[PDB]
Design a protein around this ligand. Structure first.
Ligand SMILES: [Mg+2]
Ligand SMILES: [Mg+2]
Ligand SMILES: [Mg+2]
Lengths: 64, 131, 49, 155, 171, 57
RNA sequence: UUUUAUAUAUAUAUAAUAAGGAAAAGUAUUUAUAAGAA
RNA sequence: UAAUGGUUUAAAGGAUCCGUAGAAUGAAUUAUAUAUAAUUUAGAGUUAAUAAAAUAUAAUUAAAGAAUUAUAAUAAAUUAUAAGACUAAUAUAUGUGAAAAUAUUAAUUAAAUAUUAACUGACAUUGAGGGAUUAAAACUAGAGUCUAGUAGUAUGAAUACAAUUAUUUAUAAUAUAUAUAUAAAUAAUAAAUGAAAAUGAAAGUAUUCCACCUGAAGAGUACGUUAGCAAUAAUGAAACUCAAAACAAUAGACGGUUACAG
RNA sequence: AUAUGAAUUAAUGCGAAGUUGAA
């Protein structure tokens, strides 16, 4: 009851904890980056089929 | 933004029913593309009898050509597309439903999805390039 | 009810004592002159003149 | 140091006694720890243990800000002869009206007089007073001539 | 307010991609895939064009525009990379959402549910900036000046009583 | 069956046959006790059927 | 629990092992005091 | 000489929320003299990710549908026109919304969930006064019957804790089975509370903030003021009269009160 | 304004045995 209740962390521990937390946050960013890049990759993969040219609009209207 | 349009076109020429569908599809695709849009797909549903004798303007229809057009486009431009469809004599009915692209960017049509093709990648089977 | 509500004015009802002889203006008695003498019937059950 | 947290603790001990639970937990703060120690030294509580929210600690754990949020103080309750030892617990000094008494009025309270509408000390009763951030029995507070705030009453 | 002007201008830039994308990175990834095959030009160009049209702000939802705007505001006000909860960042983000909401109600005025939502958001901003004043006097004045507000607006009691709307011609 | 296979009934809004599989002869949506679907599946089936009726299919 | 032993890739799975036993006789003042009935 | 009071039902929870003052209350550790300063993350928040239909909630626009009414025609019936209001199954208001409310379709915008990660570091609770919305009715102006209105009626909130059982409900597992665990919803309880009826995770144990009540009738009346063209609304007494009055429950006879028998 | 009186006038309280409606 006389002693301090908790041992406050030394600044070395503070720096190390900062490193761990920033690693977690940056890893989440890294996962999200992979996911967006993969989605873009699949979009570009299948973007052949999409129709942005009227000259190709007539082509596909005739085909279908 | 993805929008699936399902249009019901009138058959007035009995020998070549599909022509009005072709002309409407061409017009709407021209609108979409010329307004910085994309028309991802056109699914040609067949000719079918209507559930009732449904009436637009004065003419009364019993059978029609149904088609589905999936397109990525902006809000004002789909609004204008709908306005053109409703005032066009050829289109008995139209229905433009959003498809949420929140989780995946590339998505198939409602019918192809109902078969089980949640994205057009499975429709056109494989791409075959990695990393 | 709450300490602030008690502070702001609320409290037990004042056990207020009103006079049963208001017209005597807090005097034990008062002199008077009799205008008329009248015979009256009390509220029932009581009956009398 | 919240009187709100201490009141919540008091009600929690009362409820735990009424339903006859052997072991329960309270917040791990110095006010709560000093309270539990003073109740325990007077025989009201069976034991004090360190622990987490899940339960008492298996092995010793250092107290750091990392784990402070989930730390808990596990108090064991005494039931003797089919009755609860810690039958009742009350707060004399409510968070609204806080009662800081000088030593003379504590002596008056211990001697049977009602001061500031506080019912005086009873024979089998315990009253705790906080003086200069230390909890102590009212008798010891008088013994050390310490002015303090009267907090609670466990009977 | 110059800050709001820049943020709302970034949305209407000629080509800015949605869903967290930017032209530089998509260009890199496209060129990289094109290179990968090595170890008709018209078709690849219009394919690229279709991709860019798919990911355009002008194509995407308004919600995505506001998400990007909130990202820019956080990037501007952050104490350090990744900061999200310092009261400056909170004030900026709620400011952007307040702007979007105010537009929403201005368009159509009988939407009382969103009206009370906006009032609650404004009062939340007032509360957080009052706390900022108490904690950090310097950053508080920095922030209210950047966001376009005097201390009077934050400190005082505010509600969107219709008399407010008449005073400031809100509709 | 197929919407008891984990499929989304809203996706079946352009397929009038399957929507007809779960209505009465007069077109009445079959109550959940009859269909035996989950709640969420029943709600999307009702929404899809009413959409199909709306679009004329 | 702890310590070691074998095996496997500083660590992991298994087997064995446990230091906490002390006795002794005699050594009041208690406080302030709140009742209801028809 | 009873507030060591109460507010479902005896007088009394304000329609619902938002939030200012509060001379109202409010996290943790250390240090210094009852606070101040520095640190901390359990409360409260900010930004993302995932899962889910965040579908229902608002506004707006654009559609659909049964029939109704009226007109026209043909010989109640079949067609054709225009008009408006409403949303037949799903269906449970399950849900969503602060309440009032809200389930025909699509879209635009806005908002509402949880968990994880990160961040701020008590920024919180309640809330006088005040402010928003407030059914139906009432009428006032501008427009050609519509819009814009005046007006504001007709079991409080939060925090800590609190034994079971049985069902469901939603996830998390482990190999339909573990009659699986963790949660919330429902029903009967235990203890506890209560005048009881009854409540029974709240009408329980505690803390904090606000509103309200002080016998019946006079009386929500009169007068004055406040707004309103007015209507009305809000605030709101006093004298006189009485020993009453009221609530829950008990036994009764009573009812065209119900049935049922003999 | 603070009072004191007032033709004219509003409401309500009581009681006597009753009178009338069926809320
Ligand atoms: Mg707030
Ligand atoms: Mg007294
Ligand atoms: Mg009552």
């Amino acid at each position: 009851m006389s002693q301090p209740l908790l041992r406050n962390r030394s600044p070395e521990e503070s720096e190390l904890l900062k490193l761990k937390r920033n690693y977690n946050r940056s890893l989440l960013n890294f996962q999200a980056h992979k996911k967006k890049l993969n989605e873009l990759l699949n979009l570009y993969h299948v973007a052949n089929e999409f129709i942005v040219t009227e000259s190709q609009l007539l082509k596909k209207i005739d085909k279908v | 933004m993805l929008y699936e349009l399902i249009g019901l076109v009138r058959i007035t020429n009995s020998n070549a029913p599909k022509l009005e569908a072709k002309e409407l599809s061409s017009t709407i695709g021209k609108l979409i593309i010329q307004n910085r849009g994309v028309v991802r797909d056109i699914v040609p549903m067949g000719i079918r009898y209507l559930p009732k004798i449904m009436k637009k303007d004065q003419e009364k229809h019993f059978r029609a050509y149904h088609f589905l057009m999936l397109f990525d486009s902006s809000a004002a431009v789909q609004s204008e597309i709908l306005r053109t469809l409703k005032k066009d004599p050829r289109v008995i009915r139209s229905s433009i439903v959003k498809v949420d692209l929140d989780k995946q960017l590339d998505r198939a049509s409602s019918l192809h999805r109902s078969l089980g093709k949640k994205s057009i990648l499975e429709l056109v089977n494989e791409d075959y390039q990695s990393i | 009810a709450t300490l602030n509500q008690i502070k702001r004015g609320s409290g037990p009802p004042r056990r207020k004592k009103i006079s049963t002889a208001p017209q005597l203006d807090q005097c034990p008695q008062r002199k008077g002159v009799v205008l008329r003498v009248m015979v009256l019937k009390p509220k029932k059950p009581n009956s009398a003149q | 140091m919240s009187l709100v947290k201490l009141a919540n603790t008091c009600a929690h001990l009362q409820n735990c006694s009424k339903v006859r639970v052997a072991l329960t937990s309270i917040p791990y703060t110095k006010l709560q720890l000093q309270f539990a120690y003073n109740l325990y030294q007077q025989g009201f509580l069976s034991s004090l243990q360190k622990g987490s929210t899940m339960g008492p600690d298996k092995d010793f754990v250092e107290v750091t800000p990392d784990n402070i949020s989930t730390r808990r103080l596990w108090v064991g309750l005494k039931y003797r002869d089919n009755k609860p030892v810690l039958s009742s617990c009350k707060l004399i000094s409510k968070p609204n009206s806080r009662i800081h008494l000088p030593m003379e009025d504590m002596k008056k309270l211990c001697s049977g007089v009602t001061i500031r509408n506080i019912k005086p000390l009873q024979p089998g009763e315990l009253i705790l007073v906080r003086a200069h951030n230390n909890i102590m029995d009212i008798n010891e507070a008088i013994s050390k001539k310490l002015d303090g705030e009267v907090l609670c009453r466990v009977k | 307010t110059p800050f709001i002007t820049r943020i709302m201008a970034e949305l209407k830039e000629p080509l800015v991609l949605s869903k967290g994308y930017n032209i530089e990175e998509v260009d890199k990834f496209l060129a990289a895939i094109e290179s990968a095959k090595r170890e008709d030009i018209e078709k690849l160009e219009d394919r690229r064009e279709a991709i860019l049209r798919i990911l355009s702000m002008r194509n995407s939802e308004n919600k995505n525009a506001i998400k990007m705007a909130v990202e820019l505001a956080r990037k501007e006000f952050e104490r350090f990379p990744g900061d999200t909860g310092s009261s400056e960042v909170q004030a900026a983000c709620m400011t952007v959402r307040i702007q979007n909401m105010a537009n929403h109600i201005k368009e159509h005025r009988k939407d009382f549910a969103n009206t009370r939502n906006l009032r609650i958001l404004v009062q939340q901003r007032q509360a957080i900036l009052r706390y900022l004043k108490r904690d950090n006097p310097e950053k508080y004045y920095w922030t209210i000046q950047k966001l376009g507000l005097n201390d009077a607006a934050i400190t005082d009691e505010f509600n969107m009583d219709r008399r407010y709307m008449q005073d400031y011609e809100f509709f | 069956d197929i919407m008891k296979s984990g499929a989304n009934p809203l996706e079946f809004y352009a397929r009038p046959r399957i929507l007809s599989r779960y209505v009465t002869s007069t077109g009445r949506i079959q109550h959940r006790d009859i269909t035996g679907l989950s709640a969420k599946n029943q709600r999307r089936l009702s929404k899809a059927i009413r959409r199909c009726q709306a679009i004329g299919l």
